[PDB]
Design an enzyme around this catalytic site. Structure first.
Site, short mmCIF file in Angstrom:
data_model
loop_
_atom_site.label_atom_id
_atom_site.label_comp_id
_atom_site.label_asym_id
_atom_site.label_seq_id
_atom_site.Cartn_x
_atom_site.Cartn_y
_atom_site.Cartn_z
N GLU A 11 6.32 -15.65 -10.55
CA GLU A 11 5.56 -14.94 -11.57
C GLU A 11 5.35 -15.62 -12.90
O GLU A 11 4.41 -15.24 -13.62
CB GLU A 11 6.27 -13.60 -11.85
CG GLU A 11 6.33 -12.69 -10.63
CD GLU A 11 5.02 -12.14 -10.11
OE1 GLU A 11 4.95 -11.51 -9.07
OE2 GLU A 11 3.99 -12.31 -10.90
N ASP A 20 -3.54 -10.68 -14.49
CA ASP A 20 -2.98 -11.32 -13.30
C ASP A 20 -4.03 -11.93 -12.36
O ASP A 20 -5.19 -12.05 -12.73
CB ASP A 20 -1.97 -10.43 -12.59
CG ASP A 20 -2.58 -9.28 -11.80
OD1 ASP A 20 -1.90 -8.48 -11.21
OD2 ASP A 20 -3.87 -9.20 -11.83
N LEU A 32 3.07 -5.42 -14.32
CA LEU A 32 1.74 -4.87 -14.38
C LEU A 32 1.65 -3.75 -15.34
O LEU A 32 2.50 -2.83 -15.32
CB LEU A 32 1.37 -4.31 -13.01
CG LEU A 32 0.08 -3.49 -13.10
CD1 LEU A 32 -1.08 -4.43 -13.36
CD2 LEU A 32 -0.20 -2.82 -11.77
N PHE A 104 7.82 -6.36 -4.88
CA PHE A 104 7.61 -6.55 -6.28
C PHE A 104 6.14 -6.87 -6.56
O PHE A 104 5.54 -6.34 -7.50
CB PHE A 104 8.52 -7.72 -6.77
CG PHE A 104 8.51 -7.92 -8.29
CD1 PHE A 104 7.52 -8.68 -8.90
CD2 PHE A 104 9.54 -7.42 -9.08
CE1 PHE A 104 7.52 -8.92 -10.26
CE2 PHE A 104 9.58 -7.69 -10.47
CZ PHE A 104 8.54 -8.42 -11.07
N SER A 117 4.15 -6.75 11.25
CA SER A 117 5.03 -7.82 10.86
C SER A 117 6.43 -7.31 10.67
O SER A 117 7.40 -8.00 10.96
CB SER A 117 4.60 -8.42 9.55
OG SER A 117 3.21 -8.58 9.47
N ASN A 132 1.99 -13.70 11.84
CA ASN A 132 1.36 -12.39 11.58
C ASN A 132 1.20 -12.12 10.07
O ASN A 132 0.26 -11.50 9.56
CB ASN A 132 2.20 -11.26 12.19
CG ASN A 132 1.52 -9.89 12.17
OD1 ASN A 132 1.79 -9.02 11.32
ND2 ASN A 132 0.58 -9.67 13.11
#
Ligand SMILES: [Cl-]
Ligand SMILES: [Cl-]
EC number: 3.2.1.17
Length: 162
Positions: A11, A20, A32, A104, A117, A132
């Site tokens: 990040e 972002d 965010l 996250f 998955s 996948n």
């Protein structure tokens, strides 16, 4: 390496409001703020999160604080999610970190959506799960980060991060 360090690499750290990869207003370590297009709405969310009139800029400590909260929130959301919890429970420590990273970034809902998955991960079919996971908007939009996360699931080591 650990989850905090992992996410700090993925990040980065910005102390001034920024947009972002999807164009949303964010600050700190990937926190965010809002999906609205309004910088003002973002400023208001920021102030409300920090508890002071920020003028869109925070300190390192403020950022780290939001970060700690966000990681705690991610894990607790995983543990509260009927779909995610069993997966998490089944994984070893490194791979657990990979799952927290995805939550996250994308949210509990988002991740809960990788039905197939998840099942593969639960079954410990690493190579198949990695392939996948690659067939996703996620991978297509943020390929480098996705690759790192995916290698982590495939290998169960921190290699992608060293
Ligand atoms: Cl918050
Ligand atoms: Cl990327």
């Amino acid at each position: 390496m650990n989850i905090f360090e992992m996410l700090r690499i993925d990040e980065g750290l910005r102390l001034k409001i920024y947009k972002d990869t999807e164009g949303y207003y964010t600050i700190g370590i990937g926190h965010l703020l809002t999906k609205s297009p309004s910088l003002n709405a973002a400023k208001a969310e920021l102030d409300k999160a920090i508890g002071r009139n920020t003028n869109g800029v925070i300190t390192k400590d403020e950022a780290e604080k939001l970060f700690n909260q966000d990681v705690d929130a991610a894990v607790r959301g995983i543990l509260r999610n009927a779909k995610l919890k069993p997966v998490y429970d089944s994984l070893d420590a490194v791979r657990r970190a990979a799952l927290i990273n995805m939550v996250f970034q994308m949210g509990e809902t988002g991740v809960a959506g990788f039905t197939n998955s998840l099942r593969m991960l639960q079954q410990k079919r690493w190579d198949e799960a990695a392939v996948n996971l690659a067939k996703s908007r996620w991978y297509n939009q943020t390929p480098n980060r996705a690759k790192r996360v995916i290698t982590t699931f495939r290998t169960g080591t921190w290699d992608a991060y060293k």
